Design a protein around this nucleic acid. Structure first.
Ligand SMILES: [Mg+2]
Ligand SMILES: [Mg+2]
Ligand SMILES: [Mg+2]
Ligand SMILES: [Mg+2]
Ligand SMILES: [Mg+2]
Ligand SMILES: [Mg+2]
Ligand SMILES: [Mg+2]
Ligand SMILES: [Mg+2]
Ligand SMILES: [Mg+2]
Ligand SMILES: [Mg+2]
Ligand SMILES: [Mg+2]
Ligand SMILES: [Mg+2]
Ligand SMILES: [Mg+2]
Ligand SMILES: [Mg+2]
Ligand SMILES: [Mg+2]
Ligand SMILES: [Mg+2]
Ligand SMILES: [Mg+2]
Ligand SMILES: [Mg+2]
Ligand SMILES: [Mg+2]
Ligand SMILES: [Mg+2]
Ligand SMILES: [Mg+2]
Ligand SMILES: [Mg+2]
Ligand SMILES: [Mg+2]
Ligand SMILES: [Mg+2]
Ligand SMILES: [Mg+2]
Ligand SMILES: [Mg+2]
Ligand SMILES: [Mg+2]
Ligand SMILES: [Mg+2]
Ligand SMILES: [Mg+2]
Ligand SMILES: [Mg+2]
Ligand SMILES: [Mg+2]
Ligand SMILES: [Mg+2]
Ligand SMILES: [Mg+2]
Ligand SMILES: [Mg+2]
Ligand SMILES: [Mg+2]
Ligand SMILES: [Mg+2]
Ligand SMILES: [Mg+2]
Ligand SMILES: [Mg+2]
Ligand SMILES: [Mg+2]
Ligand SMILES: [Mg+2]
Ligand SMILES: [Mg+2]
Ligand SMILES: [Mg+2]
Ligand SMILES: [Mg+2]
Ligand SMILES: [Mg+2]
Ligand SMILES: [Mg+2]
Ligand SMILES: [Mg+2]
Ligand SMILES: [Mg+2]
Ligand SMILES: [Mg+2]
Ligand SMILES: [Mg+2]
Ligand SMILES: [Mg+2]
Ligand SMILES: [Mg+2]
Ligand SMILES: [Mg+2]
Ligand SMILES: [Mg+2]
Ligand SMILES: [Mg+2]
Ligand SMILES: [Mg+2]
Ligand SMILES: [Mg+2]
Ligand SMILES: [Mg+2]
Ligand SMILES: [Mg+2]
Ligand SMILES: [Mg+2]
Ligand SMILES: [Mg+2]
Ligand SMILES: [Mg+2]
Ligand SMILES: [Mg+2]
Ligand SMILES: [Mg+2]
Ligand SMILES: [Mg+2]
Ligand SMILES: [Mg+2]
Ligand SMILES: [Mg+2]
Ligand SMILES: [Mg+2]
Ligand SMILES: [Mg+2]
Ligand SMILES: [Mg+2]
Ligand SMILES: [Mg+2]
Ligand SMILES: [Mg+2]
Ligand SMILES: [Mg+2]
Ligand SMILES: [Mg+2]
Ligand SMILES: [Mg+2]
Ligand SMILES: [Mg+2]
Ligand SMILES: [Mg+2]
Ligand SMILES: [Mg+2]
Ligand SMILES: [Mg+2]
Ligand SMILES: [Mg+2]
Ligand SMILES: [Mg+2]
Ligand SMILES: [Mg+2]
Ligand SMILES: [Mg+2]
Ligand SMILES: [Mg+2]
Ligand SMILES: [Mg+2]
Ligand SMILES: [Mg+2]
Ligand SMILES: [Mg+2]
Ligand SMILES: [Mg+2]
Ligand SMILES: [Mg+2]
Ligand SMILES: [Mg+2]
Ligand SMILES: [Mg+2]
Ligand SMILES: [Mg+2]
Ligand SMILES: [Mg+2]
Ligand SMILES: [Mg+2]
Ligand SMILES: [Mg+2]
Ligand SMILES: [Mg+2]
Ligand SMILES: [Mg+2]
Ligand SMILES: [Mg+2]
Ligand SMILES: [Mg+2]
Ligand SMILES: [Mg+2]
Ligand SMILES: [Mg+2]
Lengths: 80, 111, 138, 175
RNA sequence: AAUCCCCCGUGCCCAUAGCGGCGUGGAACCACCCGUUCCCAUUCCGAACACGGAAGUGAAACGCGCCAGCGCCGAUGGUACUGGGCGGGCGACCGCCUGGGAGAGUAGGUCGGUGCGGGGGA
RNA sequence: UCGAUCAACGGAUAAAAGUUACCCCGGGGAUAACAGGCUGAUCUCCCCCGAGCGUCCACAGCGGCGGGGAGGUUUGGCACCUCGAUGUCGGCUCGUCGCAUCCUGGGGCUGAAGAAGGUCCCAAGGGUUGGGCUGUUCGCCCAUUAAAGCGGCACGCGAGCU
RNA sequence: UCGCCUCCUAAAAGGUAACGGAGGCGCCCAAAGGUCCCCUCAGGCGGGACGGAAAUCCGCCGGAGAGCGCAAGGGUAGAAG
RNA sequence: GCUGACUGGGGCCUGUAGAGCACUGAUAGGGCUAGGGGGCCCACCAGCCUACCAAACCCUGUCAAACUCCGAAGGGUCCCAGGUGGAGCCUGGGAGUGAGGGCGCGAGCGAUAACGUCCGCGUCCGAGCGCGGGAACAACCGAGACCGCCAGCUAAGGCCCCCAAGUCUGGGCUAAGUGGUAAAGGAUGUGGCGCCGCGAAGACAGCCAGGAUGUUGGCUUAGAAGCAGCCAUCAUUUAAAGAGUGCGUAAUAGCUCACUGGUCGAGUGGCGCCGCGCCGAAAAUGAUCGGGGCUUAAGCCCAGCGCCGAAGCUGCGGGUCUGG
RNA sequence: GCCCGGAUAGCUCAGUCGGAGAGCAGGGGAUUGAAAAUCCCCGGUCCUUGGUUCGAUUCCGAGUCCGGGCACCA
């Protein structure tokens, strides 16, 4: 319809974003970023799940890297 | 026409290798010679070099290659190096490049 | 009347009149300008009311530039109370320092007297200006 | 015909203050130099009305030097439409881009009494060796007929120096 | 064996390395090249991929330079905005202190820099 | 592993619609209708600009398109006191106040000869009819008039009446 | 109108309301899945029988505006096509 | 049992304010050009001109919650320090609450309405209807009331009287009782700053003085012979009067100005800006800024100095709990 | 007063690509012995005013003479 209201929806907030930041200690399995596209690409010691979700592969600290036109990158640095 | 099929195929195969995170056994082959270079990324560094060019040998570019592969093994295995993954670059695994690879055992390997 | 064709959305949030500024302001097309002293949504029908005041003022002669435009849709409810937004029913959002209108190719007494009439048709205080070095080159 | 103003220097001295001081914050620069400077408003005003990024301005200031500047920017604050700051560009001998005013010469010059006059520029951007600066460009072209557009190099191009172009654009016309 | 220079790989910075123009290189690398018997090929084509070659050419590609027309980068100065503290206006909104401070634009920059390894000259 | 528009989609039962002016109880001013209040879109009245009509034209008299307000008499918006009750339209009775003046008084301009008008200004002292119709307010109409004014007071007034 | 997804509102973490502004889902695919190998678009201009704005073909330019089953968004050719 | 709020430094995250137009869209003026609106030469391909349509494209110029080439201040989180607080964490017992409201800021809905409504971040009332100020007044300013005192200092706000303390000191403003109020718009109010036109080659104001020639201008006409009117408004003679700006009108007589000389004798006319004021300005029981009353102020702006002023702070005594 | 409608030669009423109509009057002709009917031919400042456009009866905007729909109250 038009007037009465044809509007009125929305969907649940997806609570998307970075869940661990640079220089933050993590364990194998911790997920570091929740995201829609490949907005951050997985780096050293970092997996991607089917939903583009980035997790630590190893314990460590997390370092962020901006490779310019190659994207941004999340790695886990060991001494784990 | 930007960024040719050569350098796509190039990049495609390369990145896949680079993810597994072994040392890289990287193969250049020109019309004349065939070279092979074992690289550790993240230190951005070559470790064990082997050319037909520097081994000054010739005839049957394939049989030359099995040789520059045996050359690499013997050379490389001497530094402790055993496991690596085969770069194969923009080249079909075939012929000359297959031959250097199946010559790169007696050391090295799974290839 | 004055009005877009093709809107991407029919209705749009009111927003603030804040921070009088930003673009327009330097008298780019003509001899004298009418600059806006206060902020306001000026309506497609006040604009046309100024235009025609001026064109009527000189002999169908002279040349007129306008230079603000009503792309912001203005809704109003019927004398109902509360359910949905809407409806209808267009404005140009105008902050201080803007040149609307701006005549050219007419005499000083003409332009200045037309612009003064034009100004009476507007909901805000105005300023007539001439043109400057300051209006640069570009 | 030839214009000079005054100038001074600054390091601290909050501009808002200077601005209340009847003065006019600005900056002095070129490839070789960059320096904070202020002028007097009314003074600057009286000259700049004639000068107007069009004719060269010799400043002065202490040291006492006299510096041969073109004005490359003026910021008016938009509310009160009045200058809040000035870029003074100082010349040395290297070619420099700039806006030269234009003398439109003729009568309607074809469709006399009359076409429609239609000046599409008061200016042209042109690269000029500073030494010879063509303080206007007579554009006669009495050919000057209905619908036509002169582009660039059909301008007089007085002796010194070439266009900053584009060689194809619109200057005037009759319709 | 260091050091420099040229080439060939190959990383990194992620356009200050790009486009366009011009110029340059074949000894050596590299390429195009000669052929298609053989490995292997092409929804047709040895174009591509692949192999066995070495007569020719740097035309193409690549590499190295030099041009600022475009593209890219880009101050200082000034404003906008603003954390915090205060005013003013019926309102819309404005202003002051203190601390942070763009974007556009102007000046200018730029025809890349560099690590590892090889081959060749020092 | 299947049977769910259990879609009112955390899904009362396996199984379910209406009406009450014949109504009742517990509650609420947490919430509607009246009045007030806030508001003033709407409404009434000013004012700015002044296209244009007015033979010409100082707007004698008009006033486009737009603009800024005043008032709080309309219709509303809101839902703030009142639902352990603030009785509702109209009439009658009795008024009182405001002035944006209907008449009378005094004025200016007139496209004011006179007389009679038009418009605007001052002015709230007093006045401001009787009837037909309808519950009407309003309005129409008859006959008069100096005139037959518009509003407020809980749409003034039901412990005053109807 | 009622559950679910996308965007805005939402004030540069997450979250955030109104009978605020706008759209979609209740499926689909044995290939539209896994892997290995290859390939790279849309558009514009020029050329070519039936071919026309568009069928196919050839040439140059074209860093992604195409494609990714369907809404939007994020993403993506160094592939997810 | 030192980890807390808050704070310092360092990293990472972000896409808002602002701004921009590269995308998505919208959009003013001009240019050059596909298709054509078709004027028509066709009626064969043609085919030119466009002051209409018009893609793309260039120039100038803008707009956007669902646009972004950009992008702050802030914010979030981690690490390292400070931080002993009616701080923090862990387990368990008892709850109450799940109607909020005002204000400030940012938004949406509303009408750039509401003591409107819906979120966000803060605050206060709620529960501080206890105190001081604001005339009076939950939530604005001041400030967190354990008890006592016929002691002090302050806050906000005040110091002519009601009413505690300046009829304080200096400088300027306003003449409306503005203050003690409401806009567009207006205006030789008034005070300051500025720029420009003319002026002792004597301007502005008055006054003395010229008040055209052909001519009725051609037009139109009983006649307009400027003034009942549509205009060729042109030649001249001058220091020098428009075939005439107005009264006039039996068209003419008679009259005035424009524009000139001259008289006299120092300013004159124009514009812009800031301060205060003025109009605009009409409601209903009796008026009023809280009242009296205030005019070199008892009003407003600037600088200063003192004082007055709470349950805040202090001084003196005391209570209770917690620590030591 | 309040929002929506339509004027067209002489009367009836088409006329959304923006660059004036057929009817039915009236005159004329053909037809007929003459007519009727039927077929041929003959003329709006297109309701005023402002606007867009080079150009508007044909697009915009009111305002008007005149048609539809609207709200006092409990
Ligand atoms: Mg969401
Ligand atoms: Mg502006
Ligand atoms: Mg701009
Ligand atoms: Mg409005
Ligand atoms: Mg209701
Ligand atoms: Mg105005
Ligand atoms: Mg870049
Ligand atoms: Mg060679
Ligand atoms: Mg040779
Ligand atoms: Mg070459
Ligand atoms: Mg920049
Ligand atoms: Mg800066
Ligand atoms: Mg602030
Ligand atoms: Mg404030
Ligand atoms: Mg910058
Ligand atoms: Mg370059
Ligand atoms: Mg390198
Ligand atoms: Mg070497
Ligand atoms: Mg349910
Ligand atoms: Mg439910
Ligand atoms: Mg749920
Ligand atoms: Mg059940
Ligand atoms: Mg019954
Ligand atoms: Mg009974
Ligand atoms: Mg019963
Ligand atoms: Mg009951
Ligand atoms: Mg009612
Ligand atoms: Mg009542
Ligand atoms: Mg009510
Ligand atoms: Mg009451
Ligand atoms: Mg009102
Ligand atoms: Mg009001
Ligand atoms: Mg009024
Ligand atoms: Mg009411
Ligand atoms: Mg209530
Ligand atoms: Mg409520
Ligand atoms: Mg009740
Ligand atoms: Mg009671
Ligand atoms: Mg009672
Ligand atoms: Mg009166
Ligand atoms: Mg009277
Ligand atoms: Mg009288
Ligand atoms: Mg009389
Ligand atoms: Mg009278
Ligand atoms: Mg009276
Ligand atoms: Mg009375
Ligand atoms: Mg009877
Ligand atoms: Mg009635
Ligand atoms: Mg009566
Ligand atoms: Mg009464
Ligand atoms: Mg009522
Ligand atoms: Mg009553
Ligand atoms: Mg009773
Ligand atoms: Mg988005
Ligand atoms: Mg957020
Ligand atoms: Mg936020
Ligand atoms: Mg739906
Ligand atoms: Mg497959
Ligand atoms: Mg392509
Ligand atoms: Mg193509
Ligand atoms: Mg083609
Ligand atoms: Mg895409
Ligand atoms: Mg999609
Ligand atoms: Mg998308
Ligand atoms: Mg500690
Ligand atoms: Mg931090
Ligand atoms: Mg913005
Ligand atoms: Mg854009
Ligand atoms: Mg935005
Ligand atoms: Mg930048
Ligand atoms: Mg600590
Ligand atoms: Mg606690
Ligand atoms: Mg507990
Ligand atoms: Mg609740
Ligand atoms: Mg709430
Ligand atoms: Mg409320
Ligand atoms: Mg409010
Ligand atoms: Mg609150
Ligand atoms: Mg309570
Ligand atoms: Mg409290
Ligand atoms: Mg009380
Ligand atoms: Mg109090
Ligand atoms: Mg009090
Ligand atoms: Mg008190
Ligand atoms: Mg209190
Ligand atoms: Mg206490
Ligand atoms: Mg004091
Ligand atoms: Mg007092
Ligand atoms: Mg006293
Ligand atoms: Mg005194
Ligand atoms: Mg008073
Ligand atoms: Mg008063
Ligand atoms: Mg004094
Ligand atoms: Mg003081
Ligand atoms: Mg004291
Ligand atoms: Mg004690
Ligand atoms: Mg205690
Ligand atoms: Mg016959
Ligand atoms: Mg006959
Ligand atoms: Mg009634």
């Amino acid at each position: 319809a038009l007037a009465s209201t044809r509007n009125g929806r929305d969907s649940q907030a997806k609570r998307l974003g970075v869940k661990r930041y640079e220089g933050q200690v993590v364990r194998a399995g911790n997920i570091l970023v929740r995201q829609r596209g490949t907005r951050f690409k997985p780096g050293k010691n970092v997996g991607m799940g089917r939903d583009f979700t980035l997790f630590a592969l190893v314990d460590g600290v997390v370092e962020f890297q901006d490779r310019g036109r190659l994207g941004r990158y999340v790695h886990v640095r060991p001494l784990a | 026409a930007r960024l040719t099929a050569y350098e796509r195929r190039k990049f495609r195969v390369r990145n896949r290798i680079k993810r597994t995170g072994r040392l890289r056994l990287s193969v250049f082959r020109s019309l004349k010679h065939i070279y092979a270079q074992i690289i550790d990324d993240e230190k951005g560094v070559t470790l064990v070099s082997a050319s037909s060019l520097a081994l000054k040998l010739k005839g049957n570019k394939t049989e030359v290659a099995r040789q520059v592969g045996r050359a690499l093994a013997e050379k490389a295995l001497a530094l402790g190096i055993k496991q690596v993954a085969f770069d194969r670059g923009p080249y079909k695994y075939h012929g000359r490049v297959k031959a250097l690879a199946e010559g790169a055992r007696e050391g090295g390997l799974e290839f | 009347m004055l009005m877009p064709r093709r809107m991407k959305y029919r209705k749009q949030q009111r927003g603030r009149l804040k921070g009088a500024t930003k673009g327009g302001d330097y008298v780019a097309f003509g001899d004298y300008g009418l600059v806006a002293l206060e902020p306001a949504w000026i309506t497609a029908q006040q604009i046309e009311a100024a235009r025609v005041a001026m064109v009527r003022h000189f002999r169908r002669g002279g040349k007129i530039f306008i230079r603000i435009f009503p792309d912001k849709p203005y809704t109003k409810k019927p004398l109902e109370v509360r359910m949905g937004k809407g409806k209808g029913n267009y404005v140009a959002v105008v902050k201080p320092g803007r040149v609307m209108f701006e005549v050219a190719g007419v005499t000083e007494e003409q332009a200045m007297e037309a612009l003064r009439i034009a100004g009476h048709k507007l909901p805000i205080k105005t300023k007539i200006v001439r043109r400057d070095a300051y209006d640069e080159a570009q | 015909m030839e214009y000079r103003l005054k100038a001074y220097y600054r390091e601290g001295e909050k501009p808002s203050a200077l601005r209340r001081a009847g003065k006019l914050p600005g900056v002095m620069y070129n490839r070789h130099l960059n320096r904070k400077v202020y002028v007097d408003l009314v003074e600057f005003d009286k000259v700049f009305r004639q000068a107007s990024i069009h004719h060269v301005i010799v400043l002065e200031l202490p040291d006492g030097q006299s510096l041969p500047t073109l004005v490359r920017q003026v910021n008016l604050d938009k509310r009160r439409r009045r200058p809040e700051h000035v870029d003074f560009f100082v010349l040395s001998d290297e070619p420099v881009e700039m806006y030269v005013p234009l003398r439109f010469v003729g009568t309607p010059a074809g469709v006399r009494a009359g076409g429609v006059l239609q000046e599409i520029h008061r200016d042209i951007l042109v690269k000029v060796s500073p030494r010879n600066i063509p303080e206007f460009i007579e554009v006669d072209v009495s050919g000057l007929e209905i619908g036509d557009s002169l582009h660039a190099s059909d301008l007089k191009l007085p002796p010194g120096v070439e266009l900053a172009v584009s060689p194809e654009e619109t200057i005037a016309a009759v319709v």
